[PDB]
Amino acid sequence: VALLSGKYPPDLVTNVWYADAIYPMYADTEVFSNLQRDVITCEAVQTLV
Amino acid sequence: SMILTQFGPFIESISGITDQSNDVFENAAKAFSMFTRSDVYKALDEIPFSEDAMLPIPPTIYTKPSHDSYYYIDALNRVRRKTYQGPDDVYVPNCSIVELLEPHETLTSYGRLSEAIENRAKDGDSQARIATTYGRIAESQARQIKAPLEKFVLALLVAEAGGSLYDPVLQKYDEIPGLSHNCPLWCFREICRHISGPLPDRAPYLYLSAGVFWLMSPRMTSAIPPLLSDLVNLAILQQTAGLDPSLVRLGVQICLHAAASSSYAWFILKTKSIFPQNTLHSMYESLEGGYCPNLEWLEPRSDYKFMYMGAMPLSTKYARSAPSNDKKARELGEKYGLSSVVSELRRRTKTYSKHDFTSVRYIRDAMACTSGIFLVRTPTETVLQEYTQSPEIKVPIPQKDWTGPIGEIRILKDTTSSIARYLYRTWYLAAARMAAQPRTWDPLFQAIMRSQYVTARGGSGATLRESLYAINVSLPDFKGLPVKAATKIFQAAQLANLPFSHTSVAILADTSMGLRNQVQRRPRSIMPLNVPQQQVSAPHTLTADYINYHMNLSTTVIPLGVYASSPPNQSINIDISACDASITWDFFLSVIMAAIHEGVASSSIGKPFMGVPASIVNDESVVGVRAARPISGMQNMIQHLSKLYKRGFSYRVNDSFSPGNDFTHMTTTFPSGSTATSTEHTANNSTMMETFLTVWGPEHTDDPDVLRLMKSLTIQRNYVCQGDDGLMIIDGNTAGKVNSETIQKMLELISKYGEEFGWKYDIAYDGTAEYLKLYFIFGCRIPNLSRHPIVGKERANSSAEEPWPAILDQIMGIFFNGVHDGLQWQRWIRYSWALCCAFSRQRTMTGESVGYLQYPMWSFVYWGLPLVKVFGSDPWIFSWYMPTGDLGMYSWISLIRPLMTRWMVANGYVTDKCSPVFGNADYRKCFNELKLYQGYYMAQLPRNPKKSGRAAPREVREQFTQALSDYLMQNPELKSRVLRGRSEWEKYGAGIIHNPPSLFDVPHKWYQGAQEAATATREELAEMDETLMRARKHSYSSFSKLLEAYLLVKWRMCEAREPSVDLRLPLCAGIDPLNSDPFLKMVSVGPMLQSTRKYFAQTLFMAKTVSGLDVNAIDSALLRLRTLGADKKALTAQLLMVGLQESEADALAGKIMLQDVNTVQLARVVNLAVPDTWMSLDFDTMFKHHVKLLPKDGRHLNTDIPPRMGWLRAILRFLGAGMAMTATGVAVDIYLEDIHGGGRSLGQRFMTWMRQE
Amino acid sequence: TQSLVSSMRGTLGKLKLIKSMTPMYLQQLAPVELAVIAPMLPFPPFQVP
Amino acid sequence: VLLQRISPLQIDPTIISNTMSTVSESTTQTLSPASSILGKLRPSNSDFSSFRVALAGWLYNGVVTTVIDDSSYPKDGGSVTSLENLWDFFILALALPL
Amino acid sequence: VLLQRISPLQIDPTIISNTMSTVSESTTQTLSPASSILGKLRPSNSDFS
Amino acid sequence: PMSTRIAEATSAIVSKHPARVGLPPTASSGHGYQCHVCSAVLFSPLDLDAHVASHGLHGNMTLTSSEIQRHITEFISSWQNHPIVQVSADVENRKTAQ
Amino acid sequence: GYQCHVCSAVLFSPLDLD
Amino acid sequence: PPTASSGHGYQCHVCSAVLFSPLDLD
Ligand SMILES: [Zn+2]
Ligand SMILES: [Zn+2]
């Protein structure tokens, strides 16, 4: 039913819509705080062996 | 035990043990009339209590000082009360009623306000007037209940003595605790015992219909009659709303502290928000799991269409990030000495961390326990307190920004630095685009504008006719009519044949008052306006209607807040305090009248509006030139209305509660009951929120976060407001919920916006939505039980109340308000049994002859109270989503019909004649014995009948009706088209219905609408008694034609519809797996999801659905003439008697001969209606997809319907869906079994009844 | 027989020619959104061909 | 309003409904072109002043260009398989030359 | 739920009903291919996720 | 306290034990041990109460407790049959959160 | 005693039901 | 075949419900 019945807004411009919607995601900066966890994980497995 | 000795069979009769029969019904009703207050107070002494109800009562209630220090006299001899703690301390004291009293002549222990004090006050003594003021206001506070007080708690004991019941679906006994456990019955019993004392008579007061009689105990205080209403309200809710002990005990503690205070109603006002603030406004504050609805907006943002896209889980991110509530609520509990209650509520609120059924039930249980009295004060306190408010405007419009006068209007300049230029722009463009419409010069539109405001609720020409005598115009008084002079219809018939210049100075007259008490609020003071003042304010309503319908269009209820409360979408609630008083001539009405008077100038340049001719006023709008400029009609109306808006309003105040008080004083407040009030407030709210967000917000911010938020918000997409208030939806972005600090900064900036130009925004921000007083958290509906009390009814006047058949009318409303709320039906509907049985017998007092009155049980089931056991059936078998009336009756007798026929031969009623519905049995000897037929036709009898008709002489009656026709119809094309439609209808279509809906009904309809409130005394009441006696003494032989027409068809239910929503989702408070029937039905059919105010508007065929007369009747008449034959000119003429241009009536008649009508609309040929119990639930998908014809076994040849007369399919839709909804359990797919007559015989019998309606 | 056959043909052809937008969305807008989302994601993609 | 009193023709209220009775259909069908007409166009005499404004707009084309409102268009671009949008195309193809 | 807040595409199953109301069905014949669709295409718990 | 009572109400409305096992079906281990009109076996409560109801004649169909409970069991069976609520969880489990 | 399915007439003997 | 008739019996031991016939009772 979602394949058969989809609609856009009656007046949309995609660059304005995406520049509105995407900015709060990249405002958040959590993704940089996972790579340090990766550092500690690889250091842990190598010091274990 | 003592109650059990007489109510042995009845307590077990309603609890599902044996079936309900007419026998125990009538014997119990004999007992229900036979009582005494001592007989009721043996009962509450008799039941022992389990000490969990026991708690200390402070002794300071019973000893309260004298009342002489609380009242004083103003310099204008106005009786007003002395405030000790704030200016909001203007209410009834709680003190010393025993001394100003004189005993009754035969009730030696009950008494009355003293006649000597009344006579000395009618002289004009100081202390006598003070004493009679206090006495009458104590009577008016004590009066505000529906029935006498002990009758409810008696029905409580009769219903709830049965003990815990058996749930048929859950197969277990409920753990609703017994009657021996509850706190409020214990406090009620002990307060009545201590107030009686050594007296043999035991009741604290006696309720006669006009005023109450007191008890001469020296410890009696006036706080007792609202307290006992609150305590019986908590006792009646705890048994049937599934409360805990603890929140009930806290509410009883707050009622005891309310009686201990210096004023009862003042404390109930000042502590009206302890229970929401600690539980609802501070809920969960750290969570881990749950489920919430995933609603989704449908993209055109004016249509308000929704989609339920399933449930979705929760996480730690969706915890409550609203700011704190601790310090303010602890201060509020600390200020009045209620710190224990607020600490207890906060301690129990901090426990819950999962959004499911039990937390929502806890919120409902906490909301239910606030006091449910009606706050009352004398009308002089209302008028001298609330009307003295006035807005403060810190940044006014500067004096250079206005031009010179045009008549008495100045124009705001274009080069204006003030914020009012956006209001000026909006109302200008709205006035121009309104006046450019060809709809506005339609004489049908002018006629419906004049028909709009002359309603039966119209008053206060009470100085207008004197002022018109004071300007020397001759008005006919119409001597000899049973109309009252105060009605707006009589006033408009006075002003029918007069030019506008004569009634031009009729605008500056005053208005009297109208009072309405509310739940936990200051009493609402509604007010009328007279006829020329409501006529002259026509551009002011048209321009605001054009705003609300075409330009800004906020909204002209529940699923909006279900969307706005969903946890990624926060919401801000915007309330405007004193919104009537905060619009004056200083800012708003000046720029409003300037913009309307300037905007209407172009497209209506010389032509006049209705009745109001053109004129001329001179202008000085350019500083160099001075000239006289011609003025159109609507401009002239703005010119006359502006004098009244500049002057302010005087109010003619007359109270019956305090003699000697009679005054007028000026005020600047906007009138509540005008023709442009709510639309005007919505328009101004929308316009100021818009110009806020697009100008004033970005001019005063530095933060890119707050600026980025305010750029995205707009009133077209994210702001919905009704009346004064509204909420603002904040959408959830990609990263989750919006940061709360930036929202807080914008909020404290909205408050600074309000304090500039007069308004005072009351803004609450707590992660919930309030909207039209419905409280939603996380997309879950929560009914406010304290908003709808069971015991109290609003009474404003001191006049005596209605006769007997209206106090029994109100209890179906009590039961339906129980239906809309979430209650355990196991003891709620059984309480409805005991109560409606208790109200059934009356003891009339006619001379020398003894007569009794009683409705049978089948009447009560005909009105919408579904049964427990019928004739050997399973206990607790029927649902309360049944239809009221014949559709309902049909459905639940059809569910049991074989077992009921087999019960007929138990105590054998056997007859050779084999009927298709019953066969072996006869039904006369059963049903006329059980008064099913008599109760069926007796329920059909009209309640509250009256006819005064005091011998109207034909000449002046005809002159009154002709002047009313002249006022309603000025334009003779309307007269020509309605006489043409009448003549063509009596030519072609008359004979089959003999009953037209016509426009000339409306002069007659308004004529008797004047005498709908004459309340004549004896003769028609005795006539009602005689009609009920002859309708009881009859013995009918069948049902009506509708029900016997229904009895031929049959159905079959199976295969158990798939669930519409998730079962684990908490969607509504008070429905859960503990409440089996309503929650199970809700999960079966799904909730409404539609705006459902445009659905019924799409149904009705009229071009704007505005007539002044019953558009349902016009659509019913068109459909009934369609289905019976009746050549198309009958329908053209039927439309022309409502009044059209002879062309669109003909086109619409040719249309309605041919098109397929929607399912819901075809109720009109057969007078069905969707019950209001089905408004919360969806029905449309059930009609389109789950009641279908042509069953699974194939054809049966009692299943075919011809292609002609295919409306029987749509009525059989209603029939099968009623049969689905009457059953307990889930909604079930039902297919169409045999009908025994065929579509031929069903169509012939339906046409046979539609011969005579 | 006849009219059910022709009505079924017309229902099927109309259902083929519904004005739907979901296939165009999947063709040319939603992969851009997946590519924008996927690095701001705590569990990275893990794809066999 | 000035040409209102000069012009001799008024609307005949019953031409449309006196037509479409020459042709008819079986009642077994659920679609009806005649009631589609009478639900589509509503005469009501409010058509008449707008027609007179459209006739008066021929005098002033340098300063005013009378066009058709967007609400008269079928809101979708229409569909040939719908008789509703077929009648919409008929109405627009009649109304555009004036 | 993150893709629902970035997708401009919306799901309107009134589109399929409004394009259904153009197909001609006789009241006579027992099979309704139009109404079978509208009874069938409503999903189970009415979730579109 | 309330949560115990509402949890018992959930367990009453959701669990009639129709719960599915993976085994070869045997003539002994059937849910319809002794159907009380004819003593057969049908391995499932929905078919068992359909067996109890179908031997009764369809003009004598009166609503009763068992007639309600059949629709209850069918309703809960289809709801548990739905896959999104087959695999779902409201709260974390120390692995998904990690 | 036995009963019929159309018109629900209850009787006593099975041959009378037939 | 239909079997139930007008009986002489009531009082289910649970649920406190008394009714038409023993054949409906059991
Ligand atoms: Zn069996
Ligand atoms: Zn029979």
From TrEMBL, chain B:
PROSITE patterns with a match to the protein in the record: RDRP_DSRNA_REO
GO biological process: viral genome replication
Pfam families the record matches: RdRP_5
InterPro entries with a match to the protein in the record: DNA/RNA_pol_sf, RdRP_5, RNA-dir_pol_reovirus
Keywords: Nucleotide-binding, Nucleotidyltransferase, RNA-directed RNA polymerase, Transferase, Viral RNA replication, Virion
TM segment ranges: none
Keyword Nucleotidyltransferase: yes
Entry similarity comment: Belongs to the reoviridae RNA-directed RNA polymerase family.
Protein name stated in the entry: RNA-directed RNA polymerase
Taxonomic lineage from the root: Viruses, Riboviria, Orthornavirae, Duplornaviricota, Resentoviricetes
From TrEMBL, chain C:
Subcellular location: Virion
Entry function: Inner capsid protein that self-assembles to form an icosahedral capsid with a T=2 symmetry, which consists of 120 copies of VP2, with channels at each of its five-fold vertices. This capsid constitutes the innermost concentric layer of the viral mature particle.
Name the UniProt record assigns to this protein: Lambda-1 protein
Native species: Mammalian orthoreovirus 3
Organism lineage: Viruses, Riboviria, Orthornavirae, Duplornaviricota, Resentoviricetes
Gene: L3
Portion held of the full protein: 786 to 834 of 1275
UniProtKB/TrEMBL annotation, chain D:
Compartments it resides in: Virion
Transmembrane regions: none
Coiled-coil parts of chain: none
Biological function: Inner capsid protein that self-assembles to form an icosahedral capsid with a T=2 symmetry, which consists of 120 copies of VP2, with channels at each of its five-fold vertices. This capsid constitutes the innermost concentric layer of the viral mature particle.
Protein name: Lambda-1 protein
Organism, as annotated: Mammalian orthoreovirus 3
Gene (UniProt): L3
Location of this fragment in the whole protein: 541 to 638 of 1275
